[PDB]
Amino acid sequence: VQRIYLDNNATTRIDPKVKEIMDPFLRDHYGNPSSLHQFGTETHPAIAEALDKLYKGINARDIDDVIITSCATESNNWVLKGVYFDECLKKGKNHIVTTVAEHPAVRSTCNFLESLGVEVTYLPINEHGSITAEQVREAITEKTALVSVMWANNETGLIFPIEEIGAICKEKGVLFHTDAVQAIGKIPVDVLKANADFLSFSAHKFHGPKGIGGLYIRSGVGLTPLFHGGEHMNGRRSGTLNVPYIVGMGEAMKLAVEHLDYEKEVVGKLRDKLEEALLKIPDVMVVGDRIHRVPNTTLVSVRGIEGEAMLWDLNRSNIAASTGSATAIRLSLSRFNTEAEIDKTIEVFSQAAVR
Amino acid sequence: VQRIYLDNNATTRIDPKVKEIMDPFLRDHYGNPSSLHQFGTETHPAIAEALDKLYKGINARDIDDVIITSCATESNNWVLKGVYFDECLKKGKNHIVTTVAEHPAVRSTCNFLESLGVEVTYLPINEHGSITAEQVREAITEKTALVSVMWANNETGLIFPIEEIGAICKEKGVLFHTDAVQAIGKIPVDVLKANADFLSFSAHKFHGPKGIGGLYIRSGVGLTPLFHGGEHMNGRRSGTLNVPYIVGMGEAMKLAVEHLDYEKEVVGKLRDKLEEALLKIPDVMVVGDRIHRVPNTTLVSVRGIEGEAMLWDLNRSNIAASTGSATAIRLSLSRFNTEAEIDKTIEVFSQAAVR
Ligand SMILES: Cc1ncc(COP(=O)(O)O)c([C@H]2N[C@@H](C(=O)O)CS2)c1O
Ligand SMILES: Cc1ncc(COP(=O)(O)O)c([C@H]2N[C@@H](C(=O)O)CS2)c1O
Ligand SMILES: [Cl-]
Ligand SMILES: [Cl-]
């Protein structure tokens, strides 16, 4: 058999170089980087280079932290629950602005924060499929502990105006967090340019293993531990280190950024090829703006047949895709798709449509 | 060179069978078990068998959960912060009993809970190196939301009387949590026998990778998510699944229990051999009871030379060991140590002592 993966926004294949680099840490360099003897110390060089790759990736500065968590979900609950005790309870600032577009790791947590008595403004999405900096300017009250905006929508692929919100945040003296999970490796990430206080990411969406992630924390921003025990990660996030995956997420980030050109040029072109080919079949129109999107995602709607049905059929022909909201069809390429595969998908998709 | 690992309470070598079993999930079966197409579904059989091994390991029942977390540290912060909003704020029960022996993942979290205004009794350790069920009976107030006792001390290897505390907990209608991280694979774990509501473990202390763990939750016990977003693990712990490690921690648990005989018979004997050999050098006495210990740990004290010094020297001769508290020397075997290695260590240790 020969299959096509087009579900890259839902997880990605670990790059073989990432697998390769992690291996020795599943074999013989199995020591706990905390122990002072030969086994922990042996891991240090590889961990620090891994970390180096991570900072370089998002243009964090030496004086910032990039903390290894177990996923973006961890990262997200940490920023929110952390600013909860820092800013909400203990500085009175009882308001958060977020969006409705956000991943449930953000929304659901907010949901519960509201149940504790926080006020949360879920900024409403407009016709463009976007959020303007102005809306955040507006809802930004004074009780505002934190702004959270995703850098890129996981369903539509839509980029938001982070840099602007970053500025509005700076001027208004409020805390800014971006969930960047869908940006890393899709489009350049610059935290400095974004004046983000906090930035989340998950390895598996850029060819790293599932079950690791990062949170970028600024210069002198504080944030109560979500994992207390203060052993690791300069007190902020306790728990024995996931060495193999740190080393891998490191490689994975490096490679992700190194292919940024590639992603926009080749992958973006493949997504344009699929997209433009597919929309030349009756009543199938793309959801959201098409200009401020990451390269790899298209979200298409086949009016009359709900998407759940397209997926089932497509699966029988060895083509993996996912659901949207609008439900529509989420095709999401990666550096490993080929034009071969796209052509094929256009063919199989169209035939599946008509029948 | 030829090295000896005796630091098994600080991390362990992944068993080669565990590495082997995880591999295909780092290669080709890279899909997100949540997606409904061929890639997510493909992971289901291996995930469910992994889970099966996990329940079987700790004798959890079908109607209980065993939730995959990213480590015991995660597990521990979850039980405590979770009963905080369930029992502390929202049922008034503003008291927790724990011990002083507990891992910082427990203590440090409690510490912060106190800073929110909770009362925590840190049960004081007696001459035996233990805690009696009676003390928990005593401090168990009425405002008592939760009892937390480790099943086995990570420094001394000392087992606690879990089954009794379990009973006291049942009679007194209070919540019981055991951090079992040092029991799995050391001594039989039975949650039913322990009447624990909650049980924590970390894979890497029984030959599974670092960065995964479990929390056992009972029948109908509730516990607010520590990771909200309610996608995964029947709402309780959100975040894309760490497939490779779930599959591995599964194998690892299976193997851990299958060697329970071995651990007590052979490894326990090796630890007795080292222990009894070492204490026949002047003013070197074992810390804590010697009878209610897991098989693999000895904690020895060389009076006159602090332990930090023994470790450095020992490291130069390729023997990895860790610190205690008393600081003493924590030698911790595993199924992979050999008598060869123990003999050698007795020799090298004694020589290092005199000089
Ligand atoms: C009783 C007990 N509970 C929780 C942990 C933490 O597991 P971890 O979150 O993977 O680091 C540990 C860790 N103990 C550490 C040690 O003994 O150095 C390494 S494993 C532990 O012993
Ligand atoms: C914006 C955004 N933030 C956080 C997550 C969660 O990362 P995860 O904790 O590893 O599952 C995701 C996940 N989105 C999921 C999806 O699109 O199905 C899989 S990755 C995300 O898109
Ligand atoms: Cl918290
Ligand atoms: Cl919580």
Side-chain angles (χ1 to χ4, degrees):
Chain A
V1 178
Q2 250 163 42
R3 21 205 221 152
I4 297 143
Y5 199 71
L6 281 203
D7 198 28
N8 280 286
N9 295 6
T11 199
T12 62
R13 182 143 123 247
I14 291 186
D15 183 304
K17 279 173 258 167
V18 173
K19 194 202 132 40
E20 212 218 340
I21 193 175
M22 298 207 283
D23 248 41
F25 300 93
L26 303 149
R27 283 195 262 86
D28 280 298
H29 302 319
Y30 62 83
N32 170 10
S34 288
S35 11
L36 328 130
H37 60 63
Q38 151 239 328
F39 301 88
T41 56
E42 269 174 352
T43 58
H44 289 142
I47 289 181
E49 274 162 293
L51 278 163
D52 198 82
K53 295 187 193 150
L54 281 182
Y55 287 58
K56 236 98 279 216
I58 63 157
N59 183 43
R61 297 170 299 187
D62 48 302
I63 120 256
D64 316 321
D65 286 334
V66 180
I67 306 296
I68 304 307
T69 61
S70 68
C71 30
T73 285
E74 180 169 333
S75 294
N76 290 339
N77 282 255
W78 193 8
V79 159
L80 293 162
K81 317 187 181 188
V83 323
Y84 174 72
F85 290 68
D86 300 351
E87 303 274 279
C88 280
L89 287 180
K90 305 228 178 222
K91 272 203 203 148
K93 300 176 234 172
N94 216 262
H95 185 240
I96 283 149
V97 37
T98 200
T99 103
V100 270
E102 299 297 296
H103 188 281
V106 164
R107 287 190 286 95
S108 276
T109 311
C110 283
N111 212 249
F112 144 107
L113 270 205
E114 275 174 357
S115 111
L116 292 199
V118 173
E119 275 152 70
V120 180
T121 306
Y122 302 99
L123 290 198
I125 196 68
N126 60 37
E127 76 290 306
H128 266 312
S130 230
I131 296 289
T132 90
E134 264 306 316
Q135 307 168 233
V136 346
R137 170 167 267 107
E138 246 107 53
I140 215 171
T141 111
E142 234 343 70
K143 228 178 304 265
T144 281
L146 174 82
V147 183
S148 185
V149 186
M150 70 211 315
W151 199 306
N153 191 257
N154 64 316
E155 321 213 281
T156 72
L158 242 138
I159 317 177
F160 295 15
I162 284 301
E163 193 170 319
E164 277 159 55
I165 304 166
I168 287 161
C169 279
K170 167 115 135 176
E171 283 181 47
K172 206 109 212 163
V174 53
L175 275 170
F176 183 32
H177 161 259
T178 184
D179 175 348
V181 151
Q182 187 85 217
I184 311 298
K186 273 147 235 19
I187 70 191
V189 174
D190 199 322
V191 288
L192 285 191
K193 298 203 348 178
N195 293 288
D197 289 295
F198 298 123
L199 182 140
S200 282
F201 56 90
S202 228
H204 69 105
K205 280 194 51 167
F206 58 90
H207 309 286
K210 289 167 201 70
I212 178 139
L215 183 66
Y216 164 74
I217 310 168
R218 234 178 210 288
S219 64
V221 185
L223 188 69
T224 292
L226 168 74
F227 278 32
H228 275 92
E231 299 252 41
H232 304 87
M233 293 271 124
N234 327 312
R236 334 204 58 178
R237 199 285 193 173
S238 191
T240 291
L241 272 208
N242 192 330
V243 176
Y245 286 15
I246 289 149
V247 167
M249 187 170 60
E251 191 47 18
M253 171 89 62
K254 166 163 204 257
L255 283 174
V257 319
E258 263 169 26
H259 285 58
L260 268 168
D261 274 342
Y262 192 96
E263 177 88 1
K264 181 174 27 139
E265 308 294 348
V266 166
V267 176
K269 212 106 316 189
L270 289 186
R271 178 281 310 271
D272 289 327
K273 184 152 184 287
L274 187 92
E275 185 159 288
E276 269 127 36
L278 292 194
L279 52 72
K280 281 179 317 188
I281 106 188
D283 298 1
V284 304
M285 340 247 113
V286 161
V287 179
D289 174 32
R290 307 198 11 191
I291 300 312
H292 322 92
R293 279 183 322 168
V294 294
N296 76 322
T297 294
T298 168
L299 184 77
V300 297
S301 169
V302 173
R303 196 222 45 100
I305 323 197
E306 19 68 41
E308 277 151 309
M310 197 48 150
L311 287 203
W312 181 265
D313 197 85
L314 268 171
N315 201 24
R316 303 199 314 124
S317 300
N318 295 344
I319 294 181
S322 261
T323 232
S325 72
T327 56
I329 317 302
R330 177 184 67 162
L331 298 128
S332 20
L333 301 51
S334 75
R335 86 169 142 267
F336 301 92
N337 305 100
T338 74
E339 200 190 22
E341 282 181 349
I342 282 323
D343 278 325
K344 176 68 67 191
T345 314
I346 300 152
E347 211 191 45
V348 184
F349 182 88
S350 303
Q351 283 164 20
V354 289
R355 92 218 196 94
Chain B
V1 178
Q2 250 163 42
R3 21 205 221 152
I4 297 143
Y5 199 71
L6 281 203
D7 198 28
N8 280 286
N9 295 6
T11 199
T12 62
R13 182 143 123 247
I14 291 186
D15 183 304
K17 279 173 258 167
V18 173
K19 194 202 132 40
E20 212 218 340
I21 193 175
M22 298 207 283
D23 248 41
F25 300 93
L26 303 149
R27 283 195 262 86
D28 280 298
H29 302 319
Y30 62 83
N32 170 10
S34 288
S35 11
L36 328 130
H37 60 63
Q38 151 239 328
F39 301 88
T41 56
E42 269 174 352
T43 58
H44 289 142
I47 289 181
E49 274 162 293
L51 278 163
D52 198 82
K53 295 187 193 150
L54 281 182
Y55 287 58
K56 236 98 279 216
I58 63 157
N59 183 43
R61 297 170 299 187
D62 48 302
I63 120 256
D64 316 321
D65 286 334
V66 180
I67 306 296
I68 304 307
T69 61
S70 68
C71 30
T73 285
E74 180 169 333
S75 294
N76 290 339
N77 282 255
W78 193 8
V79 159
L80 293 162
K81 317 187 181 188
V83 323
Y84 174 72
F85 290 68
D86 300 351
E87 303 274 279
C88 280
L89 287 180
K90 305 228 178 222
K91 272 203 203 148
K93 300 176 234 172
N94 216 262
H95 185 240
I96 283 149
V97 37
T98 200
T99 103
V100 270
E102 299 297 296
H103 188 281
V106 164
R107 287 190 286 95
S108 276
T109 311
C110 283
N111 212 249
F112 144 107
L113 270 205
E114 275 174 357
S115 111
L116 292 199
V118 173
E119 275 152 70
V120 180
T121 306
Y122 302 99
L123 290 198
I125 196 68
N126 60 37
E127 76 290 306
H128 266 312
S130 230
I131 296 289
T132 90
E134 264 306 316
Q135 307 168 233
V136 346
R137 170 167 267 107
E138 246 107 53
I140 215 171
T141 111
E142 234 343 70
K143 228 178 304 265
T144 281
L146 174 82
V147 183
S148 185
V149 186
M150 70 211 315
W151 199 306
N153 191 257
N154 64 316
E155 321 213 281
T156 72
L158 242 138
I159 317 177
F160 295 15
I162 284 301
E163 193 170 319
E164 277 159 55
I165 304 166
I168 287 161
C169 279
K170 167 115 135 176
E171 283 181 47
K172 206 109 212 163
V174 53
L175 275 170
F176 183 32
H177 161 259
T178 184
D179 175 348
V181 151
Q182 187 85 217
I184 311 298
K186 273 147 235 19
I187 70 191
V189 174
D190 199 322
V191 288
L192 285 191
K193 298 203 348 178
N195 293 288
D197 289 295
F198 298 123
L199 182 140
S200 282
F201 56 90
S202 228
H204 69 105
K205 280 194 51 167
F206 58 90
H207 309 286
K210 289 167 201 70
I212 178 139
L215 183 66
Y216 164 74
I217 310 168
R218 234 178 210 288
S219 64
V221 185
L223 188 69
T224 292
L226 168 74
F227 278 32
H228 275 92
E231 299 252 41
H232 304 87
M233 293 271 124
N234 327 312
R236 334 204 58 178
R237 199 285 193 173
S238 191
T240 291
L241 272 208
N242 192 330
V243 176
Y245 286 15
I246 289 149
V247 167
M249 187 170 60
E251 191 47 18
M253 171 89 62
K254 166 163 204 257
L255 283 174
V257 319
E258 263 169 26
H259 285 58
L260 268 168
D261 274 342
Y262 192 96
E263 177 88 1
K264 181 174 27 139
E265 308 294 348
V266 166
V267 176
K269 212 106 316 189
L270 289 186
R271 178 281 310 271
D272 289 327
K273 184 152 184 287
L274 187 92
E275 185 159 288
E276 269 127 36
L278 292 194
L279 52 72
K280 281 179 317 188
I281 106 188
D283 298 1
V284 304
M285 340 247 113
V286 161
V287 179
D289 174 32
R290 307 198 11 191
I291 300 312
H292 322 92
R293 279 183 322 168
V294 294
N296 76 322
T297 294
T298 168
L299 184 77
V300 297
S301 169
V302 173
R303 196 222 45 100
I305 323 197
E306 19 68 41
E308 277 151 309
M310 197 48 150
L311 287 203
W312 181 265
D313 197 85
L314 268 171
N315 201 24
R316 303 199 314 124
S317 300
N318 295 344
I319 294 181
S322 261
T323 232
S325 72
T327 56
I329 317 302
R330 177 184 67 162
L331 298 128
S332 20
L333 301 51
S334 75
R335 86 169 142 267
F336 301 92
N337 305 100
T338 74
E339 200 190 22
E341 282 181 349
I342 282 323
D343 278 325
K344 176 68 67 191
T345 314
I346 300 152
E347 211 191 45
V348 184
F349 182 88
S350 303
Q351 283 164 20
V354 289
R355 92 218 196 94

